[PDB]
Symmetry: D2
């Protein structure tokens, strides 16, 4: 099993009230669903990603990332978000991320294609 397979797997919530449901595989896989509390989104979207299944044992966090394309059976926002961050284990476990949201654009609007932000996920709230 991955060192933090058990720590990462489950339900996480961010500061916006979004819900991230993830399974961490022994081999580094992340699979699950994302539900955004904000933006052009409804219900759950597929996510996939990767994590470091053998992190440093010096108290460093565990690097990971995942992607959501904002298409499901309900809506298509012609966009994708990637979260890049680290899992920090312990009593108040956190996933601390920064994210990039890219929209499909014309060449003329491509300079404005991409938003950047930061989300912090906890196991409560």
């Amino acid at each position: 099993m991955g060192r933090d397979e058990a720590g990462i797997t489950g339900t996480w919530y961010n500061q916006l009230g979004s819900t991230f449901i993830v399974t961490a595989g022994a081999d580094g896989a992340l699979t699950g669903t994302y539900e955004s509390a904000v933006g052009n989104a409804e219900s759950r979207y597929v996510l996939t990603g990767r994590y470091d299944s053998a992190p440093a044992t010096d108290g460093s966090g565990t690097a990971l990332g995942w992607t959501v394309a904002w298409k499901n059976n309900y809506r298509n926002a012609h966009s994708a978000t990637t979260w890049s961050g680290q899992y920090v284990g312990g009593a108040e476990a956190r996933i601390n991320t920064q994210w990039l949201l890219t929209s499909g654009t014309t060449e003329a609007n491509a300079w404005a294609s991409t938003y950047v932000g930061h989300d912090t996920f906890t196991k409560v709230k």
Copy 2:
């Protein structure tokens, strides 16, 4: 099939000489391998991601993203990169991305955990 399933699937190269080998699934999946020409990396790493399988038909690009965790059988850089971008089809097809590279860090060094950059992928070179 996804609108750009055929356009995205295959081998791509970026401005650094890295190699991205991807299969686009009918359902929005991206699966493949990444080989970085730079950094703490050797040989291929697993990637997974997502793309908009039903993009706008107004000449906008196709949003997509993917993740590599920099662990394979050879090396572990305790880091993950996410690329967020859009596929632009036609004679000189491109994937234009921005990326976030997060390292596992101590809490003291977490302010310096994440690099940001931009890669442009083409089908030649």
Copy 3:
């Protein structure tokens, strides 16, 4: 005077314990000093920047940005940080920022030149 000239001018502290001392000019100027609690830094560094001196009156925040080059009489970290964000007025005034830290690099290391992060500044702590 700028709408938030009085609100912005003064001493701010971020989540790292850094100190930002700024004067907002009637014309949109930001001038002052920055002292980082972390990284290759000691004592104060010059900053300059700009803010929107006539923001929207719909309860939107006030856009602003500034730069520090990490050279002073004590040290030179061959780097510069830019903070981009908005001032949100009221009882618990905040400046919410994202930042880019670029180091001078060789062409070979330029892919790793730039860090991205987020700082939140308050008038206390």
Copy 4:
């Protein structure tokens, strides 16, 4: 004088056809004007920033950054952009940047406040 004071001072153009007119001071200051070819912008806007006036002599680039608040006598886009990057001297001098564009937003829309992109400036075109 700054090592690259003479190299930086003058007129630069980016890949969008924007015009950046900058004076580099002996002490690290950047002052000038910016004219964007794209977005909610017309004519020139004030910029200020900083650069490393004593860079490494190992062939590394020169770190620098600057800010534009998108208010002038013609328009107010209630936003500010910061460019963070490095100057690379020689026959085909370049300023390679990444940028953050923050808009004033309501708290509800603050997750979508900030765009990220990359501009490359040359002395011709």
